[PDB]
Design a binder for this molecule. Structure first.
Ligand SMILES: NC(=[NH2+])c1ccsc1
Ligand SMILES: [Ca+2]
Length: 223
């Protein structure tokens, strides 16, 4: 997260870290058995880390649970990042508490201008590299589809939306992928891609979760 702030320990209790020897992506807990992330975060051997604040220090509220299965969206296109969503099942159910909590799925899509909370452990610099140990947060509005498509001509599908600031300076970034965009208490986005980070006229691009609710519900009910 570039241009954000330190969230505070466990203030984003649905935020998970995906670990394969190291943190590599975020995700969102949607019930005690299932996490939503980005398809481009897929790999085998994922451990889900819940209740994290400092990802380099055991602080006492963590749960570390191996994935038993991953399901990449059937229409995921790795070239274009269309349908950049996957589901991860936990080998054992998480123990839900105030610091490890699920986030509700949308009952409809969110409007342009709605303010959202974006979070993760990704790079905090727009030029150069600095990774935080603690979770970072950014408040950012959903942008109009025209401003999104103008920024990324030929690259935006109806399964993507933009959020952030056209002036630059505030954005998600590498290492935040797969993590949440929460608006009005619902998981409306997944950190997906962008051009650099926090660059002018290049806002972040997010998977449009509201298009996937039926797929999510049916997939988790059958797996
Ligand atoms: N600029 C962004 N929002 C971004 C997200 C993942 S990699 C870059
Ligand atoms: Ca920790």
């Amino acid at each position: 997260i570039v241009g954000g702030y330190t969230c505070g320990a466990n203030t984003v209790p649905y935020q998970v870290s995906l670990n394969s020897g190291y943190h590599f992506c975020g995700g969102s807990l949607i019930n005690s058995q299932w996490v939503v992330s980005a398809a481009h975060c897929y790999k085998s051997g994922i451990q889900v880390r819940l209740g994290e604040d400092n990802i380099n220090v055991v602080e006492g509220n963590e749960q570390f649970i191996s994935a038993s299965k991953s399901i990449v969206h059937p229409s995921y296109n790795s070239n274009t990042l269309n349908n950049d969503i996957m589901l991860i099942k936990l080998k054992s159910a998480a123990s839900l508490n105030s610091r490890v909590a699920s986030i509700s799925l949308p009952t409809s899509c969110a409007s342009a201008g709605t303010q959202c909370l974006i979070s993760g452990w990704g790079n905090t610099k727009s030029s150069g590299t600095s990774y935080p140990d603690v979770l970072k947060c950014l408040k950012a509005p959903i942008l109009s589809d025209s401003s999104c498509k103008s920024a990324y001509p030929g690259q935006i599908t109806s399964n993507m939306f933009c959020a952030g600031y056209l002036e630059g300076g505030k954005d998600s970034c590498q290492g935040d992928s797969g993590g949440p965009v929460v608006c009005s208490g619902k998981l409306q986005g997944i950190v997906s891609w962008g051009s650099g980070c926090a660059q002018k006229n290049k806002p972040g691009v997010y998977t449009k979760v509201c298009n996937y609710v039926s797929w999510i519900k049916q997939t988790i009910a059958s797996n």
